[PDB]
Design a protein around this ligand. Structure first.
Ligand SMILES: Nc1ncnc2c1ncn2[C@@H]1O[C@H](COP(=O)(O)OP(=O)(O)O)[C@@H](O)[C@H]1O
Ligand SMILES: [Mg+2]
Length: 330
């Protein structure tokens, strides 16, 4: 058991994989928490074991309830947590972390069944803290890391080529200060959608003008909750919660992903001198990874033979981050 959790989500087939005659090579056993890959067919097949395994049938709501809700509970109690989406471009990192809008109908009191972790997170924060009388405020920031350089995606008025500078925080040795990072106040439950729209417009502008392609860059979405909870005949709680929702660069890409791997592996194995400072991303997230809290990695994969090499590469990366023994085959 552990505060570091590694899970695998397999997306269903697209149409390019079906027409190209590609065949499914991945077996996901949620009950046994196992992913099996036909590397030869019928000979052998390689089995991996993880903390949870979500098959191609998994809905967004199930990912949120299983992975995020236990973590969001710790955030609302006043801790800093991080959830990663790792995997090959096109396997569902952004779909899992952010989700999509359904063009049919219009969800208002109901969550879009395609909404991802970020919208469901903000909606649960607003509904839970309003329902229990908490005096609370919410801030969100969104930055992008390309070529080890930081770009704010929420600054309404910056110069596209302006990169954020990062300084050590004299108050907490494990924290950093991202000078100029825009932090938008979220005033109600649904405001997150227009926030993500502004960030997407800044993202494509940075792509067209600076070649900062979103498939090759990390996206760090941080939600900060300041909380004052008053209970007559109880206590007055002043809490600050922080959840970083990290949509990583495509894993087919270079060293910052391997640095993130060495950090998680070191946190799992409890080896000294976790190499936080060897990459910008892990230095950003040190205060949420260092202080003992909950961290989850959602490793996304494709089931088609077309992507065999990168799927094996992803499972190997997730296995190296948290090595769990395979239970004896039945
Ligand atoms: N679990 C899933 N269920 C249904 N569709 C998915 C799933 N994961 C990914 N997709 C679809 O695959 C396409 C690419 O996914 P995307 O989120 O862009 O992957 P990535 O962000 O890793 O590049 C999108 O059209 C998305 O809707
Ligand atoms: Mg993406």
């Amino acid at each position: 058991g552990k505060n570091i959790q590694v899970v695998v989500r397999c997306r269903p087939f697209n149409l390019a994989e079906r027409k190209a005659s590609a065949h499914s090579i991945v077996e996901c056993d949620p009950v046994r928490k196992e992913v099996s890959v036909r590397t030869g067919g019928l000979s052998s097949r390689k089995t991996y074991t993880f903390d949870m395994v979500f098959g191609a049938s998994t809905k967004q709501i199930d990912v949120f309830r299983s992975v995020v809700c236990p973590i969001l509970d710790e955030v609302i109690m006043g801790y800093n947590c991080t959830i990663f989406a790792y995997g090959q471009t096109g396997t569902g990192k952004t779909f899992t972390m952010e989700g999509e809008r359904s063009p049919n109908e219009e969800y208002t009191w109901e969550e879009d069944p395609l909404a991802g972790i970020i919208p469901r997170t903000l909606h649960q924060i607003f509904e839970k803290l309003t329902d229990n009388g908490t005096e609370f405020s919410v801030k969100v920031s969104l930055l992008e890391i390309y070529n080890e350089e930081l770009f704010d995606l929420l600054n309404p008025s910056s110069d596209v080529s302006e990169r954020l500078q990062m300084f050590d925080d004299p108050r907490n040795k494990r924290g950093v200060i991202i000078k100029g990072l825009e932090e938008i106040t979220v005033h109600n439950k649904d405001e997150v959608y227009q926030i993500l729209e502004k960030g997407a417009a800044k993202r494509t502008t940075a792509a067209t003008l600076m070649n900062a392609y979103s498939s090759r860059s990390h996206s760090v979405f941080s939600v900060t909750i300041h909380m004052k909870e008053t209970t007559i005949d109880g206590e007055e709680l002043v809490k600050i919660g922080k959840l970083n929702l990290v949509d990583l660069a495509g894993s087919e890409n270079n060293q910052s992903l391997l640095t993130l791997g060495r950090v998680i592996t070191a946190l799992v194995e409890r080896t000294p001198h976790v190499p936080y400072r060897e990459s910008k991303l892990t230095r950003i997230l040190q205060d949420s990874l260092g202080g003992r809290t909950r961290t989850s990695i959602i490793a996304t994969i494709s089931p088609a033979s077309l992507n065999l090499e990168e799927t094996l590469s992803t499972l190997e990366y997730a296995h190296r981050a948290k090595n769990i023994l395979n239970k004896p085959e039945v």
